[PDB]
């Protein structure tokens, strides 16, 4: 129930505003900046502000905060979803989200803002569908919005029918300073770039544990996804009935399904780091990385971030494999490794100075984060079984998919 959607800037100037109900005066945006400054300076700053009887719930973008004023008991979740959809639409239309396009793409921005939401109730959010009715360089609105299928424009024709899939893995590990892993969750991501002719009805089929149990094959390697979130094209009823993943793929790259299940296996990389920090004299970093992953897999672009002292200067690194550099902007040791074969063991011996004068205030212990990304490795063991591409005209599809394993929330708590 947003009253006026406005786009602010880093200096407090509203780049663009679009009132939806008009029940809130446009002058309330001026008090948002002082209120945000007071909240940030007192630790009470939150994305949902409140100027008396008017609430300013908005998120911070790359360069400006998309603040949407509201006065009644509007749905905060609905406002957040609308803001996320607007951000996605802006990213799809404009390659950059900065003030350079706000003051240059106002002609199409105003039209998009007017068409997207009316009276505070959004109606269209598909960038691909919206690109056929509002352009910055107008015909009747497409029937896709009026029809049930609002995410697949009819009449799409291509020379070839190739669909590229991406089974991206997110290895998130929360290892405490005692050496035990607390939060170890792996979230699957099935992102597909469907490029076919017509409006095919994809029938996704994988070796799901539930599907195998229902079919009676609950004895082989089956993926046990605790949470499975299908896209808008995926029919919820079909999945709820008999685990049938039937949906119309969109034209382009989109997230069809996103599995999310816990992981009870050992970490693919084991980091043994020590801190021999002398009292204002020197420091030692006996960091040893052990790869627990399969030897057939190589972790391309391994970046184990080791937080070094903030005031440390004149550091020396005695490592074994990979380039180690200290970035003063981040104040940490970047253990950058290009290719890390599975089972490899890298040992490092850091040595940096420390000023005699102690710091005025404590700086904390940032967690050690690894940036391992090993492609062609499915840690969860989930493999795509089939993809039923059916078209009324009739064509031979050539679906493709790749498995990518990377490190997600793989942070290591410091001692």
């Amino acid at each position: 129930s947003a009253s006026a959607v406005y786009v602010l800037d880093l200096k407090g100037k509203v780049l663009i505003c679009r009132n939806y109900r008009g029940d809130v005066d446009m002058s309330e945006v001026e008090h948002f900046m002082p209120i945000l400054m007071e909240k940030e300076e007192e630790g009470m700053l939150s994305p949902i502000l409140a100027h008396g009887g008017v609430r300013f719930m908005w998120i911070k973008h790359n360069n400006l905060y998309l603040v949407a004023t509201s006065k009644k008991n509007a749905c905060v979740s609905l406002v957040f979803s609308f803001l996320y959809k607007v951000v996605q639409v802006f990213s799809e239309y404009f390659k950059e989200l900065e003030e350079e396009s706000i003051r240059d793409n106002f002609v199409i921005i105003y039209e998009l803002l007017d068409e997207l939401m009316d009276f505070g109730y959004p109606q269209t959010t598909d960038s691909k569908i919206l690109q056929e009715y509002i352009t910055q360089e107008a015909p009747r609105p497409p029937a896709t919005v009026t029809n049930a299928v609002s995410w697949r424009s009819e009449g799409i024709k291509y020379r070839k029918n190739e669909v590229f899939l991406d089974v991206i893995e997110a290895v998130n590990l929360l290892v405490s300073a005692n050496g035990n892993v607390l939060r170890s969750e792996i979230v699957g991501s099935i992102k597909m770039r469907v490029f076919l002719s017509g409006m095919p009805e994809l029938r996704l089929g994988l070796n799901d544990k539930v599907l195998f149990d229902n079919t009676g094959r609950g004895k082989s390697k089956s993926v046990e996804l605790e949470d499975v979130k299908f896209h808008q094209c995926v029919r919820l009823s079909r999945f709820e009935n008999d685990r049938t993943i039937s949906f119309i793929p969109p034209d382009g790259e989109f997230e069809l399904m996103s599995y999310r299940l816990n992981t009870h296996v050992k970490p693919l990389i084991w980091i043994e780091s020590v801190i021999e920090k002398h009292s204002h004299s020197r420091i030692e970093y006996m960091v040893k990385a052990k790869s627990q992953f399969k030897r057939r897999s190589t972790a391309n672009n391994v970046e184990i971030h080791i937080p070094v002292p903030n005031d440390a200067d004149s550091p020396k690194f005695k490592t074994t494999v990979g380039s180690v550099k200290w970035v003063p902007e981040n104040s940490e040791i970047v253990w950058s490794v290009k290719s890390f074969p599975g089972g490899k063991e890298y040992l490092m011996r850091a040595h940096f100075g420390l000023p005699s004068v102690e710091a005025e205030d404590k700086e904390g212990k940032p967690p050690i984060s690894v940036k391992f990304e090993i492609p062609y490795f499915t840690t969860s063991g989930i493999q795509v079984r089939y993809l039923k591409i059916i078209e009324k005209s009739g064509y031979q599809a050539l679906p493709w998919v790749r498995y990518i394993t990377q490190n997600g929330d793989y942070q290591l708590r410091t001692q």
Partner: peptide, 18 residues
């Protein structure tokens, strides 16, 4: 080639499940 694992072709359905 492509970083992150080479793309592999996908099947049409569970041929072993009819």
């Amino acid at each position: 080639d492509r970083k992150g694992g080479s793309y592999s072709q996908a099947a049409g359905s569970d041929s072993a499940q009819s």
